[PDB]
Amino acid sequence: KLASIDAQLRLLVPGKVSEDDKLVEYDALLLDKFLDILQDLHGEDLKEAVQQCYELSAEYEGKHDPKKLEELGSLLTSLDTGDSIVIAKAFSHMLNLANLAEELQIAYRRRIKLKSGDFADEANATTESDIEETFKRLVHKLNKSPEEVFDALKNQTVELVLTAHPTQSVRRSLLQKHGRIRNCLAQLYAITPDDKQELDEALHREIQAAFRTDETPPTPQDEMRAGMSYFHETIWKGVPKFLRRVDTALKNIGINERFPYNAPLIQFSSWMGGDRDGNPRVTPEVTRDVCLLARMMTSNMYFSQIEDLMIEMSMWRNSELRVRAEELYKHYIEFWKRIPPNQPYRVILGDVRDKLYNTRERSRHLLVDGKSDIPDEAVYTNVEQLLEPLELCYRSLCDCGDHVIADGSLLDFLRQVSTFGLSLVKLDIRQESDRHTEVLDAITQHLGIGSYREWSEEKRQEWLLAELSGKRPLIGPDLPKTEEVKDCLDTFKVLAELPSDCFGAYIISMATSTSDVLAVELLQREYHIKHPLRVVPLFEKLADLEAAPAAMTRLFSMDWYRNRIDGKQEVMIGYSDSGKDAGRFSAAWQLYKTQEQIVKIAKEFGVKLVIFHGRGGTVGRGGGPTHLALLSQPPDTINGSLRVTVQGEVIEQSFGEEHLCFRTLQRFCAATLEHGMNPPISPRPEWRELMDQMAVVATEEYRSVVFKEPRFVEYFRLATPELEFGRGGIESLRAIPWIFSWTQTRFHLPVWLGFGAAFKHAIQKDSKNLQMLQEMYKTWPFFRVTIDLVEMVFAKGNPGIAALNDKLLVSEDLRPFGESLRANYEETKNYLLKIAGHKDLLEGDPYLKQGIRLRDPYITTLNVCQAYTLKRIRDPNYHVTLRPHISKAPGLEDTLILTMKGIAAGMQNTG
Amino acid sequence: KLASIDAQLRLLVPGKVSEDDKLVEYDALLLDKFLDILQDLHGEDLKEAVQQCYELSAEYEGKHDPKKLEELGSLLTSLDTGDSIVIAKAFSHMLNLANLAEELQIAYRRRIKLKSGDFADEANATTESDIEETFKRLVHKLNKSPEEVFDALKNQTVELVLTAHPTQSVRRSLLQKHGRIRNCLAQLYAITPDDKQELDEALHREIQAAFRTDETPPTPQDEMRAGMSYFHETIWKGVPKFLRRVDTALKNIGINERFPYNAPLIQFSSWMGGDRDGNPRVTPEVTRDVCLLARMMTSNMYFSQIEDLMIEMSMWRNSELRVRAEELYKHYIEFWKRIPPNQPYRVILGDVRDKLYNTRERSRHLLVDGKSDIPDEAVYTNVEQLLEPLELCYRSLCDCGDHVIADGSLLDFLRQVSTFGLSLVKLDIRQESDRHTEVLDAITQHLGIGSYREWSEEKRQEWLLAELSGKRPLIGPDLPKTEEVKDCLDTFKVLAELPSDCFGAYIISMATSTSDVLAVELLQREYHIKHPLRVVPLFEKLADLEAAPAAMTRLFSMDWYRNRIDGKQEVMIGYSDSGKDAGRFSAAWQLYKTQEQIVKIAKEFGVKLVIFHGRGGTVGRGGGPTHLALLSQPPDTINGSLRVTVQGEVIEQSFGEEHLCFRTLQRFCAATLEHGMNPPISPRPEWRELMDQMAVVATEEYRSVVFKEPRFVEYFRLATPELEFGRGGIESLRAIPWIFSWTQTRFHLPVWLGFGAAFKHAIQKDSKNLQMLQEMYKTWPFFRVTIDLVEMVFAKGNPGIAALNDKLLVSEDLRPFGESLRANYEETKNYLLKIAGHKDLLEGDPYLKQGIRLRDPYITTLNVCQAYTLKRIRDPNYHVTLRPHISKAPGLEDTLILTMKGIAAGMQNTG
Ligand SMILES: N[C@@H](CC(=O)O)C(=O)O
């Protein structure tokens, strides 16, 4: 029955049916209910068709018989456009279901009571240290006093920077539906029979509601609002829950005070409407809009919880607040008459409410009108104005003997205010160096002094330092401006006009020089920005990384810059970007080294350095693995301040479920604290040498395939949906489409290519290297974590899918090239297994393996569907006999979009 | 430790420590945490003082040594005014804590799986039938088809009429705190150690927050708002949860449809601001105000959940709604931009939102301004206008294939709308017959036609029928009006002007005649009320009850009245009122008979009769007992329409906790349905005869003590805090103060007096009567339920408290009178025990016994405190040596108020 579907699913994932392992059951239950829904909505035949795709696809994943893939192919090419959309919709939705189930399983999986203490424990959610356990290791194993631990945490800073979903920001409505499905599932395993019957019917109903929210592309403004949804869903509440647990952990190590409510321990930021790199749709107007939206939403969140705080704050008992209440003494849900003065905390909070309302309304009018007449004194323009009256309530309760009450909801609110400020996320701006060069070259030519672009690096620096202390402005009204130059100058206009608490960093993409950084500083001074954004270079190519040290050295040598920077500098690294240039192995090692070198240079100059981790690192995986990934960082690269990218495709895993949200915040904080007092071992010299030797080879293999093979590009454009995803060659292609196109094929070339040659050569040069590599794997956190990510990527790989795409889409003369990349994949995988000490992929993480494995049949169905869809899109003369319509003006591009989104939702993070 | 307090509490309530019996543990935990709070806030010495009062009081309740009561007395009279308030505050708060604990215990107590099927099962929450089990008994035992059962429920009507708390409407803020204490307690027995530590600290904090919400009397408007709080807390959500369970129960008996969303199964009403009987503070203005408030709140509740429904209703798929959406196509929390038309359900619900807002705002302006310019078309003036667009969404989802989605939140909302309408509660007006007589006598004299008051009953009727068809109005501008006559006429003005959906019944207090009812009908016609309120007589004294039949017969004989009444009449009975006149036994029996007789008369005339149950009956107990109480009603007295008083002092028990709320709604519905198809046995003729004989004697004893003893009044005024509760003789005293004054003394004279003589005489006249009475107890639901309520009242009794009040407050020459009432109490109790077949009070309901028993020590402490406080208030020359202040311009009246409220909160319902 349900028993039958359960049995089916267990053939792919068998063995240890323990008591907290319910994942297969959850999946069975959801799939069962969804198959009924499909029958009701679309008819028995369609249900049977979906069931048959699933079955065929399961059998192919079980035994890997390519006849099975071909059968599923036949079935799928025969479907008319309409049936084909329903099938793609069905399997995408099954994926979202399996992901909700898996989150529930990770949320309730049992922790290991006794931990071995090896660093490997920190790779796994069930064994990793929580905040208390981290405190205790630091006190007992590293001989820190509890006070020292407390003091470091007080000064610590963790900043999570949210980026756009590369394929599909899940809309607010749907995400809530996903939440309720998950909750109904949870509650079903808590239970009276009638409750079960009712929950059962409520589950059924929510699965359907989700499926039928299934309606061209979205505005960046809307993409921003969709990306902010997780605040409401979890983070908003989660921050105070986690800070409260810090309090408890501090108490359990002998610290008899709460973690101060205004320690800036957690900060969130955003690139959404800020990053315009290679993206001219992100205009100045978009930037202004998302700043106002962030401000609107934050005030609105405070406003919509302040009435609850006012109810709870009924107390009648200090003179400081008494006085304020007396001074102060309509269209709202709760306190719509004047508050009486015998309710003093409500008089204060009543004023805070009104002010919050006015702050929210100004932003709304600024947004939809263009201006508002609402004045500064009616509104909060700075976060201290909002804290102040809340601190007053806190103190008044303490002075009147009610400390204990103060530390309830009021303390929660104080923390939310301190963490989220007036703008939930501070926005980073990002733009590429060449755009700044263009802007300056327009200025220099118009001024008649030559062409900045033609100038040497020394000349650029000399001219920029002279104009950074210039007495005249640079830009006259008659400066002629291309659209691109205007768009870049008007971005600074927007920075000059919006409050500084809207913004974080100005990241320079494709940075290579001292002058790139100075260029942006000059444009900010020219716009007279009261509080210039800090300037952060992103060095992308290997060569750029190699030139970064000399570039920072020079910046830090310049009096004007040192004085401006005030002891602090941030530098950004992008793992996926560097891996596109050099292969992932060589980018990993180079990035390790570069960070060492820049840390040393910072120290020498008495500058505190923050490394901002862009996408594609081990640290962006989420979950347990992020925890060891953080502790693997080179010594002193964190030093009390973490700034990391939370990748769009991981946001749901990290923050969709309340427990996972809590644990994400916890491991980021725990890991940051620990690393500064307990660095991973530094590598043995033999390891460096071998890693250098392996980098040279890995880069040679990767580059010879990706850049020197004259037909690589052509192979890429056929074997991969890259071109269709649009809706020079590889050097010019951006990192996201690179990773994505190969992830859609289940092949992942960008992640593993180069590791094969590195290993083969090392082991062939000297047999003893195998053992050295294995020791590196057991003992060197950096190496372990590097290998693990790639191992996780191979578990999501299926060379049979790549083969099928070759048969359908690649011309015959390219097929053997494809075949040879598949042999490289196999050989690379096997070398990685031998180094990891494993027979099977992920035998060190069987819960992850199970999760990925349950997804495969669904993903595979979408892959097969996609492959034929691309055949049809690409070739209007390919046709087959379509079956008479099975279901009860929408095209092939629509089916492909569903396919791409479904695969990406099942593939989640890779490289 | 905590172990120590647990042991202490178990000495009063020992034995069967089973697994779902946690009440003592809960109490221990709360008391433990509260004792710490007291130490922190007021010092160790005060904590020790509270502990010692508790101990002394526990020992007195254990062994009943009167030396122990005297010690507690000494301690308590020695306390200065300030210490004395803290102690009274502490013990009142302990009571509220024990009540929250007890609710949690009743919420989670385990149901008996197998029920014996005796009607006694329905007295007890653990054994009573739920709605499904009621359905099944009707189908299988009474041979009803499931369709017949379904049809009766569809036509069934249950109306719960909320009345003011007689002592203290708990304010909205505090009630929420009580809720969170209870929740934190629940969650503590669900659990990771850190969660427990956090819940532990959250419990601690909420206990304190409650204790320090401890701030002259309240406006009826405010009393009304406080009495409405339970809607927000439970009832609002509870109605749809219960209707959904009806759906499930129907499905489980083979009915394949949901209970229709607009079946008026549940209705709530209110007397708050409506009842002005003996209460001139309840003015026309108050009535207008609470109608507008009810309207304001209801719109506000719909408004504040409509945004959630709009989020969830994302669906894009019927032409009827499509069309409406197109036609329709800012300052809010969620949808503050214009809704797009590809979101059709949101366009519709967006309009409903705006309309709800405007409906809420009109009422607010009408209330605080006096008028609004906001027009009828901007606002809902009738419930169908609000349903209509919701029915449209429901139909559109069904027509587009989404039946299952429609039956989620949308169906819930539809039910809330159908149940609560535009005014959460419909308001009853009540005023006494003599006020109408006065108003008419003013009219007749001014008209020069004589004095209505002087006229006979026949003349009154003749004149009223002639003027009910009169062609001129009665009231000219120059009619002279006392303040009372004006207040009564202006009430009808308010009825003429407010929408009819604000109101329910016009109850006439002290009704005796046909003409009393006609009088009110004439005043309503004179005010041209479009939809006159139905006129409902409340016959109070025995003699009035005896004259009621001839009065209804005459009304039902009059063409004008029959035509006006349109086949329907409601009559009200007041158990506490009739018991004040005749003693509770004789009022119970007479009320049984009168209801029989009026049912017969209704039938004869083809009038459907509703009996409205005023306060003081078995049916007002709440909990399990209410369930048998309902099924005990005389045959055909319910007949598909129940209308009962939910007494203010029981509201918290019935609706404060969500499970209890659900079960209250369930038993009212289950019991009503069943009774109409399965009447209790009718009494054997020997039983009637004996009951008549016992009534004559019970009334003679009660009346000879209460009305003929010349010094009774004087004894009452000293032994009881009656006079102080103010802030002819007994005939003139209202029922609430009568019950209350004796409940404050733990003596309860009004409930049991008369039962002693009834039993003694019956058993002495003929020994065989003992056995007849016992059979009546085992077999006759009416008798059983009658005896049970009195048995529950004796469990709350303590003649030692009455004795102490006598020593302190009654003069020596009255003390033996007091002593003789105590001998009557003892003898009456023992007779009741013998008839019930019990050795101890409540051995048939040990869970109730435990609950009442845990409260006693607290109540006793307050009693002792009260007794000396009254001594001090009454006698400014009584003094004792006060102890130096123990704690770290407030008087004796304040301590007494705390005392009275505390005792009433522990005594809950009695007579
Ligand atoms: N985020 C997981 C992978 C996944 O669940 O797709 C990991 O990196 O281990």
Ligand SMILES: N[C@@H](CC(=O)O)C(=O)O
């Ligand atoms: N309401 C309960 C009495 C109580 O708990 O005070 C009953 O009537 O049985």
